Design a binder for these strands. Structure first.
Ligand code: ZN
Length: 19
DNA sequence: TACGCC
């Protein structure tokens, strides 16, 4: 629960995008 | 911000 690729409550994919 | 992708 958090990011998509990172693993932290920083943001979601539209704010990450980080592959 | 960058693949929402590996
Ligand atoms: Zn992330």
């Amino acid at each position: 629960k958090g990011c998509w690729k990172c693993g932290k409550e920083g943001h979601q994919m539209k704010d990450c995008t980080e592959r």
